[PDB]
Design a protein around this ligand. Structure first.
Ligand SMILES: [Mn+2]
Ligand SMILES: [Mn+2]
Ligand SMILES: [Mn+2]
Ligand SMILES: [Mn+2]
Lengths: 187, 187
């Protein structure tokens, strides 16, 4: 019944913030999720956490000693994932990358979209579930999109990512450019 | 640009009907999609096509001679797919099975949900896009759910499937159980 949600090894802002955000969505719907991380938080992500007054996810090396099932955000390939990923069931994946080095024994909820950031997809999922995005969660989701898009300069950034960042900046109460440049400079 | 939408080799009713239904949705949304099939239509599927006045999708052996990109419904595993799947880009997958024998070079729209039929997922996609399901298309979608669920008897059947079947039967103008028994008998 408890599940862990995490992104990839060598975490980036999307991998930390999308784990926290998806755990919030799961918990606001009555489930039992803890967001965790697989490595050290970098200076860009730490700026986001500090700014929006959010705790760092707990660091884990393995999952099977804790839970039976996990959710992956921002990755799918086994070599990017937790070291004992073969010993737990992947219940869901929310991601924006190519699929490789990944198989399941059972059906699952797999949601990949060809957008520039996982948090763009989570924005969609909050709205599909009629769950309000709290100011600080919006700030973390905005941070993820700024990070993965290089402040909207990456060709991986789509109109969906820009539209999500506009929504989330309004919710978070920040100017995306001013906040984004400070966040990126902290990294 | 033209795309082909298809389900698996040895087609079943979900693989035919979900290809037709998702091509309808795509086309309503301004794309250029043709549903195709990879083998012969069985008698159960033929009943559904005849009842709802739909033509059997065109049979193909290969896709790369026609298009650059394809959408898979009701499958992902390469050995279930078209023989030259590695020569085209997989743009999207809509499915309800485990993931295996499947990789992509690029990102894509991958939507798997742990439900009993692809058409239950497509029903959500119509509603997400505010596109009306025409009577005949609802009939094919209902046929897919009855087929995959064995008239709601299969261990894979969920409450999401049962609910979608009732909705689609109302739109199609049939009684799900009465129509479904005749369709199943035809196979
Ligand atoms: Mn990442
Ligand atoms: Mn990312
Ligand atoms: Mn099938
Ligand atoms: Mn199916």
């Amino acid at each position: 019944e408890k599940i862990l949600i995490f992104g990839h090894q060598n975490p980036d802002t999307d991998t930390i913030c999308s784990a926290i955000a998806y755990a919030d969505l799961k918990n606001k719907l009555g489930f039992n999720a803890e967001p965790v991380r697989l490595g050290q938080v970098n200076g860009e992500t730490q700026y986001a956490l500090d700014y929006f007054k959010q705790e760092s996810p707990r660091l884990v090396e393995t999952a099977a000693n804790e839970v039976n099932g996990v959710i992956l955000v921002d990755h799918n390939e086994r070599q990017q994932s937790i070291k004992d990923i073969e010993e737990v069931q992947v219940l869901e994946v929310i991601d924006h990358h190519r699929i490789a080095n990944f198989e399941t024994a059972e059906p699952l909820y797999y949601r990949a979209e060809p957008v520039g950031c996982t948090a763009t997809i989570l924005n969609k999922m909050y709205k599909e579930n009629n769950v309000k995005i709290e100011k600080e969660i919006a700030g973390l989701m905005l941070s993820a999109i700024i990070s993965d898009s290089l402040l909207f300069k990456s060709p991986t950034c789509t109109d969906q990512d820009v539209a999500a960042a506009k929504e989330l900046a309004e919710i978070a109460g920040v100017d995306a450019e001013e906040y984004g440049l400070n966040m990126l400079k902290a990294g």
